[PDB]
Amino acid sequence: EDPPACGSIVPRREWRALASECRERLTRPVRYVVVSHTAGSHCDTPASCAQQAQNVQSYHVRNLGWCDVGYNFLIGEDGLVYEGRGWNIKGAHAGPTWNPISIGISFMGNYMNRVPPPRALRAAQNLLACGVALGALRSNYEVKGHRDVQPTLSPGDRLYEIIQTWSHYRA
Amino acid sequence: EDPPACGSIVPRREWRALASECRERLTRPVRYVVVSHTAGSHCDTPASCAQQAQNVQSYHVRNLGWCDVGYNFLIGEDGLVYEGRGWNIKGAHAGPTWNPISIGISFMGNYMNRVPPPRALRAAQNLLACGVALGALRSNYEVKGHRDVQPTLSPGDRLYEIIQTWSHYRA
Structure with a gap:
């Protein structure tokens, strides 16, 4: 209802989220x-992306039994x-x-043969600063591709090449 | 050499902006x-907002013969x-x-009857703290309504009513 924080971040409630049941917490400042x-x-x-946020959560919660959507944060091609x-x-x-030693951000969509827009890329890099500001992220935080930590295709071939160029990226 | 930026802003190039002909600078930091x-x-x-910025810039430049779009920054209902x-x-x-001692923020629309959505209000508010971060605005900066310093309905009653509630607003 009332958000005055960085990153013009769409609140759980603005995208009609179900409430978390999660209790385990991260030992800050996080490095990864x-x-x-x-x-x-x-x-x-x-409009589309809030619905899409709902969809991802619903699947993790109703279907996979999770306490909440799995991602720390979600980035839409709306740029939010x-x-x-x-x-x-x-x-x-x-x-x-x-999971415990890192924060996870997820671009909404498949970027194997697509690239996400600059706005979404900005929204992301902004997100990271805002986290260091709030001391959620270590100042010298490091960025990894999903596929650098687990055998997956995530975050997609195209998106993965983008993030390799980031100053804070480590393979 | 100066370290990294703040905020997320759609650059001029990205909303297909004509080039600026403006040379007059503001004195940093700006009080208002x-x-x-x-x-x-x-x-x-x-997509529609990038077009509306164009249309505003256009009217300002082509019809009013200003050096650029008047406002220092514009806000889309898209939340950008x-x-x-x-x-x-x-x-x-x-x-x-x-004009010589202020940053002017316009919201793309007419907020006389409609309200701006929170994502708009979030962007604007975040922008301002970026200004502070960067040293473009003073830490003790002051927000004013357009109607507070000219004879105008702008920024619109609904929006006017809202901006009054902000921490930095001084009638």
Whole structure:
């Protein structure tokens, strides 16, 4: 209802989220940031992307039995960031090694043969700064591709080549 | 050499902006911020908003013969900031008293009957703290309504009513 934080981040409630049940929390400041893709439906507007946020959560919650959507945060091709578990709650995105020691951000869509727009890329890099600001992220935080931590195609071939160029990226 | 940026803003190049002919600079840091509306057509998509910025810039340049779009920054219902004159360049939005000592933020639309969606309000508010971060605005900056410093409905009653509630607003 009332958000005055960085990253013009769409709040759980603005995208009609179901409430988290998650309790495990991250020991801050976190060092690792894991970039993924939903491998789900792409969305270019905030109407579409809020619905799409709902869809990802619903599947993780109703279907996979999870306490909440698995991603710390979700990025839409509308250029907005979507709050999931947020800065404090341990995510479920990178398996047991990398879930507790990292934050996971997920681009909404499959980027194997697509590239995401600059706005979405910005929204992401902005998100990371905002996290270091709030001391959620270590100043010298490191960025990993989902596929650098787990055997997956996530975050997609095209998106993966983008993030290799980032100053904070480590393979 | 200066370290990394703040905020997420749709650059001029990206919303297909004509080049600026403006040379007059503002004196950093800037004490004031004036909030207007376009009293124009609104847009809830990155795609339609990028067009509306064009249309506003266009009218300002082509019909009014201004050096650029008047406002330093524009806000889309899409939840994105759209770059105008930016931080360092005096603008054309609040007349000669106010134009030399203020940043002018317009919301793309007409907020007389409609309200702006929270993603808009979030963007604007975040932008302002970026200004502070960067040292473009003063830490003790001050937000003003357009109607507060000229005889205008702008930024519109609904929006006016809202911006009054902000922490930095001084009638």
